[PDB]
């Protein structure tokens, strides 16, 4: 049944919209990141809604706990696609939006890509199997909380509870649950590399002729400043 419902809700192809028919740009790279985001985001917000258990949580945490594993949430599904699609040979972003390593220099985000690029190594060399990946997936979701609490942290506390089990369940075991935990603990350090970038690339945005979309701009000044200055943290296994 959980598997069941994680596949059904699981997000379809997301598209970018760059122009791959013009040279690379700094600019048009990472307009077309944001625009992406902004898309991706949309289906984050379906799909986290549509978890099982995901309305036990008050009204106020769910959009809150969703912005806060954004990122992250992000990074794992491309680390995936990337492995399924090209073997890990570039990211994927999405299908007119690969990164060959010019590209990977072009977006000044070069070390966060290639740390994406060997988490999505990763999924291939811990042999990861797609039910895994749903499921490490969703745990995600329940990976990063506010130091003074949410609405209600006993209601989420039981949902990642949960989802743990679950994952506990797919297993079924000691070995395989401290190599999947690793796993999901490396994206975090990913995450908030990113979130540095795209910080401090917002408030020059201006200075870049960078376009941000609105809900990508709130996200990024309103709860990512509260990632960065420590007041929101990841929830680490090890
Ligand atoms: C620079 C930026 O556009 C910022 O996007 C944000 C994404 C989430 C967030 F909470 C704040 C900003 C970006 O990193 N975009 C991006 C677009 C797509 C994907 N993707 O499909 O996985 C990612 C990725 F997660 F890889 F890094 C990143």
């Known amino acids: 049944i959980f598997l069941n419902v994680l596949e059904a809700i699981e997000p379809g192809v997301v598209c970018a919209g760059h122009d791959n028919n013009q040279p690379d740009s700094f600019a048009a790279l990472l307009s077309s990141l ?24 008050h009204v106020d945490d769910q959009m809150a ?3 806060y594993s954004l990122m992250g949430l992000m990074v794992f599904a491309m680390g995936w696609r990337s492995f399924t699609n090209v073997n890990s040979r570039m990211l994927y972003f999405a299908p007119d939006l690969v990164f060959n390593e010019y590209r ?40 990063i909380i506010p130091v003074d609490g949410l609405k209600n942290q ?3 506390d039981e949902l990642r509870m949960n989802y743990i089990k679950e994952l ?3 297993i079924a075991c000691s070995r395989r649950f401290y190599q999947l935990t690793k796993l999901l603990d490396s994206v975090q350090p990913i995450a908030r590399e990113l979130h540095q970038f795209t910080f401090d690339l917002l408030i020059k945005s201006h200075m870049v002729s960078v376009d941000f979309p609105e809900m990508m701009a709130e996200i990024i000044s309103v709860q990512v400043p509260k990632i960065l200055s420590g007041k929101v943290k990841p929830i680490y296994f090890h």
């Open 104 to 143: 990977m220099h072009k977006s000044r985000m070069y070390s966060q890509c290639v740390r994406m690029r060997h988490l999505s190594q990763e999924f291939g060399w811990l042999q990861i199997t797609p039910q895994e990946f749903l499921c490490m997936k969703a745990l995600l979701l329940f990976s």
């Open 168 to 170: 506990d369940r797919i």
């Open 154 to 156: 006993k209601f989420f």
């Open 65 to 67: 706990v969703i912005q």
């Open 34 to 57: 944001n625009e992406l985001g902004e898309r991706q985001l949309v289906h984050v917000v379906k799909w986290a809604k549509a978890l099982p258990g995901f309305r036990n949580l």
